[PDB]
Amino acid sequence: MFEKLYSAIIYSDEFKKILLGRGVDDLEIASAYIAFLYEDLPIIGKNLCAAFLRMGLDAVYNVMPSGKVYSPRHKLYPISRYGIDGVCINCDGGKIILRISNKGYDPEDLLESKGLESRIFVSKNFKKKSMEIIEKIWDVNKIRLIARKEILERI
């Protein structure tokens, strides 16, 4: 059920390393979990992992210099914008605001929440926990190599 989520995280991590020289961060990873739960919710702010979930490899065409994605058709926006509302990733410009906190959801518990509150809190080490799970189940080095090759053919 979750293959698209794991692949979005690996592909976005490899793409960000190619473009900006660093991997995706905790909030960017959390955006893919939110996008996995709410297909119709605009995601505003740190959203690269959500973009690979919604757009696949086509996400590479819509990345801003900041590493955030602009794609109205997929309800992805890099900054607060007139006429859009949704979840603002670690920003105040939204009717739902997502932040990191000590008592925030771990990845698995986030995916089990039934209900969209106005304030979403995710645990610290969100990336670490997501990445530990994926390396446990998949041959991540092999997938990373395929992802890099496929990304570079589009770039």
Numbering used by the authors: 1 to 155
Give the exact sentences the study uses for this entry.
Genome segregation is a fundamental process that preserves the genetic integrity of all organisms, but the mechanisms driving genome segregation in archaea remain enigmatic. This study delved into the unknown function of SegC (SSO0033), a novel protein thought to be involved in chromosome segregation in archaea. The segC (sso0033) gene encodes a 165-residue hypothetical protein of unknown function. SegC has a tertiary structure folding similar to those of the ThDP-binding fold superfamily, but SegC shares only 5–15% sequence identity with those proteins. Surprisingly, we found that SSO0033 exhibits nucleotide triphosphatase (NTPase) activity and assembles into filaments in the presence of nucleoside triphosphates (NTPs) and DNA.
During the crystallization trials, we also observed another crystal form under different condition after a couple of months of crystal screening. After further structural determination, we were surprised to find that only monomer structure was present in the asymmetric unit, hereafter referred to as SegCm. The r.m.s.d. between the SegCm and SegC monomers is 0.42 Å (in Cα), implying that the overall structure does not change much. However, the electron density in the C-terminal region of SegCm (residues 155–165) is missing. The loss of the C-terminal region of SegCm (residues 155–165) may result in an inability to form the AB dimer interface, thereby disrupting dimer formation. To confirm that the missing C-terminus was not due to a flexibility issue, we dissolved SegCm crystals and measured their molecular weight by mass spectrometry. The results of mass spectrometry showed two main peaks for the SegCm crystal of 18038.6 Da and 18143.8 Da, which were significantly smaller than the molecular weight peak for SegC (19859.7 Da). This difference in molecular weight corresponds to a peptide of approximately fourteen residues (including six his-tag), implying that residues after Gly159 are degraded during crystallization. Thus, the extreme C-terminal region of SegC is crucial for dimer formation, as its degradation destroys the AB dimer interface, preventing dimer assembly and even further affecting the genesis of multimers.
